[PDB]
Design a protein around this ligand. Structure first.
Ligand SMILES: [Ca+2]
Ligand SMILES: [Cl-]
Ligand SMILES: [Cl-]
Ligand SMILES: [Cl-]
Length: 261
């Protein structure tokens, strides 16, 4: 993996968003996993030496992003600083903002989805439906508290650009809260769309026409979930923002969504 790792590390250097004595902030590309297949962990030693020379020890992970998420990712030079940043995340002191394109427009256009999640991720609500009536189900012992704030930034009648702030940090919470809580799955979320994890996301004739795609190609549409911003408390605040990927910019334009003012 070294040849490929070197090339990837150089690519990451070209996209660095912020550098100081403590941190290196990268723009994680689409499809790159954090852990192992080339992954971020494979290039931590390489990127370190690329930035600080042959004596440099590896950079350290401070938090994780999923494979199909893009954008802001903080690395640290020092292990103790990595631990400090990890603790900021654990204790909910970091503002995490994501941008997503959704199929359908959330109603209400701003709010908070607070339904717990159980881990294969699903919602775990207070009631069950039997033969059209509600039956109270005792809270599952493995349900995890999950809270996502959201705000529509731009919308058509059929698509939205949505700002998301996961307050908690539960696996796939943004995707599950949008799809199952709001019936507004993220564009490209084949796994969490149409109650069939094996089937490609179903898109309307009009949405396909805007995108310039036939339904047979919908399966190749990537997830549209970007880690847009992180605000870290002082290690004054560090306010990190990452440009959208070109593919996401393209989809926004095709879907007639606007950037916020
Ligand atoms: Ca599906
Ligand atoms: Cl998610
Ligand atoms: Cl659609
Ligand atoms: Cl941008």
């Amino acid at each position: 993996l070294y040849f490929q790792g070197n090339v990837l590390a150089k690519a990451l250097t070209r996209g660095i968003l912020h550098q100081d004595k403590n941190l290196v902030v990268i723009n994680k590309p689409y499809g790159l996993p954090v852990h192992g297949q080339l992954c971020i962990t494979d290039v931590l030693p390489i990127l370190a030496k690329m930035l600080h020379g042959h004596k440099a020890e590896p950079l350290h992970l401070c938090h994780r992003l999923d494979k199909e998420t893009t954008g802001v990712m903080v690395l640290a030079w020092d292990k103790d600083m990595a631990h400090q940043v990890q603790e900021l995340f654990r204790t909910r002191q970091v503002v995490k903002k994501y941008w997503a394109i959704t199929v359908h427009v959330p109603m209400p256009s701003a709010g908070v989805v607070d339904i717990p999640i159980v881990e294969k991720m699903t919602l775990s609500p207070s009631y069950r439906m039997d033969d059209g009536k509600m039956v109270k189900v005792r809270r599952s012992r493995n349900a995890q508290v999950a809270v996502t704030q959201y705000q529509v930034l731009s919308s058509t009648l059929s698509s939205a650009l949505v700002e998301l702030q996961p307050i908690t940090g539960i696996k796939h919470q943004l995707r599950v809260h949008l799809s199952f809580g709001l019936d507004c799955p993220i564009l490209g979320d084949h796994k969490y769309s149409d109650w069939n994890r094996l089937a490609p996301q179903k898109l309307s004739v009009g949405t396909l026409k805007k995108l310039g795609l036939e339904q047979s190609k919908a399966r190749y549409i990537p997830l549209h979930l970007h880690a847009r911003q992180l605000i870290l408390p002082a290690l004054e605040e560090l306010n990190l923002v990452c440009k959208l990927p070109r593919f996401f910019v393209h989809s926004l334009h095709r879907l007639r969504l606007e950037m916020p003012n």
